Design an enzyme around this catalytic site. Sequence first.
Site, PDB file in Angstrom:
ATOM      1  N   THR A 127      20.206  99.219 -34.963  1.00 26.80           N
ATOM      2  CA  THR A 127      20.414 100.435 -34.152  1.00 26.80           C
ATOM      3  C   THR A 127      19.214 100.799 -33.261  1.00 26.80           C
ATOM      4  O   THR A 127      19.380 101.052 -32.078  1.00 26.80           O
ATOM      5  CB  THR A 127      20.872 101.647 -34.999  1.00 26.80           C
ATOM      6  OG1 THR A 127      22.186 101.399 -35.510  1.00 26.80           O
ATOM      7  CG2 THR A 127      20.913 102.918 -34.167  1.00 26.80           C
ATOM      8  N   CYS A 128      18.009 100.803 -33.820  1.00 29.28           N
ATOM      9  CA  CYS A 128      16.828 101.146 -33.032  1.00 29.28           C
ATOM     10  C   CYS A 128      16.467 100.066 -32.028  1.00 29.28           C
ATOM     11  O   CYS A 128      15.856 100.366 -31.004  1.00 29.28           O
ATOM     12  CB  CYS A 128      15.603 101.375 -33.915  1.00 29.28           C
ATOM     13  SG  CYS A 128      15.889 102.074 -35.523  1.00 29.28           S
TER      14      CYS A 128
END
Lengths: 174, 174
Positions: free
Chosen positions: A59-60
């Site tokens: 996600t990051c």
Amino acid sequence: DLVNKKFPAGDYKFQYIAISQSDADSESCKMPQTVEWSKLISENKKVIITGAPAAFSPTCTVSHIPGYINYLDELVKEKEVDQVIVVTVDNPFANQAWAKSLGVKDTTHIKFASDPGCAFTKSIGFELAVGDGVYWSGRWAMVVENGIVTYAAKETNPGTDVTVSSVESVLAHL
Amino acid sequence: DLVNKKFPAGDYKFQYIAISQSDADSESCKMPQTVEWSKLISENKKVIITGAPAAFSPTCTVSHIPGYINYLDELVKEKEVDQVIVVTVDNPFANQAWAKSLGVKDTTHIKFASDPGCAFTKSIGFELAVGDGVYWSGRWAMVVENGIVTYAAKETNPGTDVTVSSVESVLAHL
């Protein structure tokens, strides 16, 4: 909530590791630098901080951060931004390496900060609880002008979401 | 001290993310997995565990870990050794990524484990204090055979030294 009150710098610190071409031209193998939050803020009229749960996490790495690297140019020059700080609780070596894999060549307007044991991140209520008392940063984003927090949002589901924390949304408040 | 007693597994658990050859024929893009220390050890006749301070940091990355990957094969084919676990307090994604960068292709016999908040390493006394309540792992090695610690040593200056924690020492004690 921290919006439009003073920036709560306290006496908290962070550590990043420099990345440069010009130095690359001039060999140095970098060790962590220590900045006082209070010092950064009162030294730069306009700062962006965003928090990330874990360096290298999908996600990051795919969905949240690359955005800021892309807009870095528009941020610094058009929006007069001074510093963009990425924050994780991950060691500053793993943050530097992460910053590299993502394409960062120069840390003059972008820095990948450790927040050791989430001290700072907790103190503003933007941490993520992961169990047995261990704290990661949430996914969040914050704008400081003149020493005042003008923007600050937390994701409800950081694991998967990048919305209020997204460089786009940030730009909207710029 | 820990040598010659039963492995103090208590009820601690670590996390890791897999790497694989057969699942390159299968492209599965993994998240972390949990493993109870106790089970790992019970399931396994011979376990090398080594702990390192900071993922992607120079001593860890350059002087220390490679050894254990270097000799991954002799440990397994000439030293009866079932698992080799690399322990950090770093996040599993930052660990898996570090792994791949060191040139790991499959997690069958090597695993980059997260010991979150230094919980396990604190409990055995092999921690490294880094300030403000924050702990990294120290530099340490340990062998566990049939549920019992035959070898356990920690560097005194882990920031600089790769000695008692070296894969050379582990090998000498096997």
